[PDB]
């Protein structure tokens, strides 16, 4: 077997897509009415977004969770002074900025924001 | 930007391991004993795992989440009968059976697994 695609839940589509268009990510057209929209990544693995009702008809179990982050995302960028820079857009569009760029004992500029959903985003870059 | 990595929090990086070790996935060696691990996917995007110890070093606010899954990981199988037989493995060997194989909607022979920190894992494979 091999892995093909990421998949996360979203509450409001059109929501979560503003976010992941602001971050760079490629977004299908029109993907703010469809039940199940898939980004295209490097190499071809996928990140794809359901929404809560289209898990439900599968899935009927699905709640949201509460509390902390199982999974992140991590964006990398090409000097740490970006990594500062876009968190403070992200933060100014009202996105929920977690912690604040530091930089990270493994070696890289790094800065945590949550996504509508409450998603953990990472953004990096190392450090020279 | 670009997405260059996935990370998952972990309660036991050994226990993980196993599971991942079982999907297919190439796992570094002697990674039971690391706070951080990753596995390389095509394209180049990487899979990573976090000890709990790890992630509230720099994020002490990290607390599990408890309820439904915000993401999933999903495995592609090169047949439909290879999802229920890797879905009846997984079951044999103790891991969380979340829904039993079927015929989805959108096209693909379906199963729901969970990892042992109760991750949602997709198997699935395209229809005939
Ligand atoms: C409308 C729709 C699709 N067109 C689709 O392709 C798909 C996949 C594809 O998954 C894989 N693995 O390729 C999955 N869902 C869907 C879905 O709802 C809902 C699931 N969450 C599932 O992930
Ligand atoms: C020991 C250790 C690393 N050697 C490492 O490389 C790394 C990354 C790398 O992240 C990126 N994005 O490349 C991240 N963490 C770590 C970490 O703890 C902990 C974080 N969760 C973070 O994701």
């Known amino acids: 077997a091999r892995i093909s695609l990421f998949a996360v839940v ?68 090409p000097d740490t002074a970006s990594v500062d820079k876009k968190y403070a857009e992200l933060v100014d569009a009202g996105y929920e900025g977690h912690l604040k760029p530091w930089n990270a004992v493994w070696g890289q500029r790094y800065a945590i924001v949550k996504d509508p959903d409450g998603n953990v985003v990472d953004l990096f870059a190392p450090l020279p």
């Open 10 to 77: 979203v509450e409001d589509m059109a929501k979560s897509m503003e976010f992941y268009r602001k971050m760079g990510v490629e977004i299908p057209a029109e993907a703010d009415s469809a039940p199940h929209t898939e980004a295209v990544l490097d190499g071809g693995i996928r990140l794809a977004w359901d929404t809560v009702e289209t898990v439900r008809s599968y899935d009927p179990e699905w709640q949201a969770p509460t509390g902390g982050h199982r999974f992140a995302i991590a964006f990398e960028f």
